[PDB]
Design a protein around this ligand. Sequence first.
Ligand code: HEM
Ligand code: HEM
Ligand SMILES: Fc1cccc(CCCNCCc2ccnc(-n3ccnc3)n2)c1
Ligand SMILES: Fc1cccc(CCCNCCc2ccnc(-n3ccnc3)n2)c1
Ligand SMILES: C[C@H](O)[C@H](O)[C@H]1CNc2nc(N)[nH]c(=O)c2N1
Ligand SMILES: C[C@H](O)[C@H](O)[C@H]1CNc2nc(N)[nH]c(=O)c2N1
Ligand SMILES: [Zn+2]
Lengths: 405, 405
Amino acid sequence: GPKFPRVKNWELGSITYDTLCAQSQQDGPCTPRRCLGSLVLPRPAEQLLSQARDFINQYYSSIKRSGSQAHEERLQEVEAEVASTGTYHLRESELVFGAKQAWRNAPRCVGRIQWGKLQVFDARDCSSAQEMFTYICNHIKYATNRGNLRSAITVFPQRAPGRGDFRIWNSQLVRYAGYRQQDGSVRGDPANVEITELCIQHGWTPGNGRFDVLPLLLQAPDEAPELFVLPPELVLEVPLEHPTLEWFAALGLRWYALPAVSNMLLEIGGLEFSAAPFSGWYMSTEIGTRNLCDPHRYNILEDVAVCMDLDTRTTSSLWKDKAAVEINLAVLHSFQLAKVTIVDHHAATVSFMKHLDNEQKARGGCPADWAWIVPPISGSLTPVFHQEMVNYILSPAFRYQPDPW
Amino acid sequence: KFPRVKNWELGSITYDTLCAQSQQDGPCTPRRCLGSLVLPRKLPAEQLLSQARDFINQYYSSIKRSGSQAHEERLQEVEAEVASTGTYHLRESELVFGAKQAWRNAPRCVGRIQWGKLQVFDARDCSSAQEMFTYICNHIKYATNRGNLRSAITVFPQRAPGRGDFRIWNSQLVRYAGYRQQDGSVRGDPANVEITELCIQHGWTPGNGRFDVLPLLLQAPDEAPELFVLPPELVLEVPLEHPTLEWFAALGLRWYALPAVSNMLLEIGGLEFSAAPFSGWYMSTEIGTRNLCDPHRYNILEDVAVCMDLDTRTTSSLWKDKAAVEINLAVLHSFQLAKVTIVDHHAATVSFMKHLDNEQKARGGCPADWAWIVPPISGSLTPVFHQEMVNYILSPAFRYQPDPW
Ligand code: HEM
Ligand code: HEM
Ligand SMILES: Fc1cccc(CCCNCCc2ccnc(-n3ccnc3)n2)c1
Ligand SMILES: Fc1cccc(CCCNCCc2ccnc(-n3ccnc3)n2)c1
Ligand SMILES: C[C@H](O)[C@H](O)[C@H]1CNc2nc(N)[nH]c(=O)c2N1
Ligand SMILES: C[C@H](O)[C@H](O)[C@H]1CNc2nc(N)[nH]c(=O)c2N1
Ligand SMILES: [Zn+2]
């Protein structure tokens, strides 16, 4: 056989070899001695030029003008630009290409079948926090599109030598408040206690509900962040009801439509875009299993099981399994009823296999994080469970970055 | 620089420093992570000697005698025997220690809380297929124990540089036949088509049901394997019914009580035992989810869905998830009613968490394969989902080896 990692599908018996991974410049957490793939937190002078060069080569290949005059001049242009300023800038269409390619490269995203259809908003002219808010609102309105959801990213100015970053402080554009109680419990989402307390320390008047939408804390270079409240009619939400358990609607559960990640760094050709929120549409277990059922999130499993009258006294009743199923169904059903785009874990992983097969033909491999791609309920029921995956970092990339506080 | 292992539900952090004792490489390297592969790709005398000394050291340490007369004299014994013969032999109590330690070290086993309670049968004085059979029968009898199962291992004679290995050709001691139909399909268990064909060809008379227990092919060194039918009365089986779905028993489903792995190689102190079958008791998802719902196994999810009257025509009705849940319920109910030891995936993973904790205290870590430990349904509903894990190879170890045909 060839000298590349052999990849196997155990449902179908079919083999592939990943040859893409040879183009991995940046290393991962693993050595020949121990496997750190399950761990969730994955722990320039001439160094910029070589990343830039390599990026410009990717751009040129993808437009098939590799080795052209236009290619060799762009490289010279980037040399010279780095030469006199320490940095360089991307052509509009270089940024569009880099953004889709960052998405294409993201090992943990299961929606990558869609990678080619990404609206890139170019917001590198933005010069204030107020202006970031407008751009974000535009993003929300465009991506939400009354429930007919549309992938999009907005790119604010790149990190710049010595001058401070644009940062959105919130981890998503839509997030519910988490209020620490005297009894030590939390009202709302325990995931958001810190950013809740920061919004208050920064003058937000806090509600006290279970599903208060957070204000955005936005930060322009070298300035304190500023608070912006989203006008409620921009933030589309779905009340959760269950197609047959009539009492589930009485639980007053809801979820927002737009999943928009706002604290990741987009790295292109060595340039770093510290503020570059992106959004897709939800895969249903992100809501019905993680957000509503994690013990450290809303944790509603016992409540739903009690209403369903299950024996919550014994693990072997499978009461957790039954409640989780019904919560996922409710989420699916309610987004359907509301006409808000959503995808179940079956449809999603099926499309993601199609994705793998496309990338196998197009680039000879596809970096994929098995733990993240396999859904949190019904694992071996989906085809990705039976698919081996190779995980590696390719650039352009979306990367985590330290919280700005 | 050591592995920092974090729990994402409780927020607590440990350090694995046990992996420092890993001598053998896993499928991973800096540039690409390979940990979701089922088979990692590979499937003088001082080498053997340092493995021996090392194991001998582990043993004496275990019994708190590390520097005794007994210790130094055992090391010279080992040394003298290797120098003169290129090999050596284990004392029965070292074997007992080695086998428990191989189980303890198995990264994929969720049952390791039990590791200290392992009945070890020394069958190293075996010399023919017939002797193998007798010992295998006593194993089954002992381990089965009328349904109150007990962990056991029987160890046949070690590989010898000279000659062919003792092998059990079956991958499990109890396995159902899979008969290929001239029209594509398989009657019985599709995972066993090959071993079913080999049995017929070495002259067994095949049945034609969905649940025909296979004979064993046992092979003494350099001989054609021989066929031994297990006497029905040793093979305890549990017919499947559901606590409330009355039609479910009509499905004529059943499964065997004894889960016994017979194709793995046991490596102690550099010695290799190519026939060393072991058994515990099932975790229910192995049967309810994988064996009966894998598409390429009994694949019964649609039949059940249709009896439950579900909307089969759409993924988003979650028909697969519902059916799977009841099928797993049926398995637990049925083993409980037959009074046959079983553990559901919630109890099992809770006890594996306790295990990691004991192991942290006792050894500074525990090798674990996240993708194997996390069950095939209801992942994030179990605490192991939320727990980071470090996979690495310690010896003594259970290993895969080539099929002997
Ligand atoms: C189009 C619909 C999309 C679906 C269904 C989807 C699905 C997912 C899911 C389920 C995850 C893992 C979330 C988690 O458990 O934390 C994920 C991660 C990710 N997605 Fe998407 N995604 C979509 C669109 C996008 C877009 C438009 C981008 C960027 C342009 C993107 C980039 C990412 C990245 C970077 C991650 C990993 C984030 C992390 O490590 O926390 N996705 N995706
Ligand atoms: C006491 C009850 C036990 C339970 C509940 C249990 C549970 C499990 C489970 C769920 C797996 C993964 C199985 C699969 O998906 O193929 C596994 C694998 C394994 N178990 Fe156990 N186990 C038990 C006893 C034992 C014993 C007695 C040994 C050996 C002495 C053992 C050694 C292993 C090994 C070596 C593997 C890896 C098998 C492979 O790679 O295919 N287990 N165990
Ligand atoms: F504290 C932490 C450290 C590292 C990862 C973590 C997981 C949260 C981030 N996962 C992204 C979740 C998320 C939310 C909304 N939308 C998306 N999204 C949008 C498009 N594709 C994915 N993804 C926590
Ligand atoms: F192609 C392959 C080659 C080797 C292993 C594979 C995985 C399946 C076998 N894993 C063990 C299954 C199994 C069955 C019964 N019992 C146990 N068992 C008993 C105690 N602990 C686990 N384990 C595929
Ligand atoms: C320890 C483990 O890596 C952690 O729970 C992971 C598992 N798989 C995941 N998968 C997705 N999609 N998202 C996550 O946050 C996680 N968390
Ligand atoms: C490709 C993937 O690693 C493969 O499906 C694994 C995943 N996890 C598993 N986990 C267990 N316990 N048993 C298995 O057979 C598998 N199969
Ligand atoms: Zn790895």
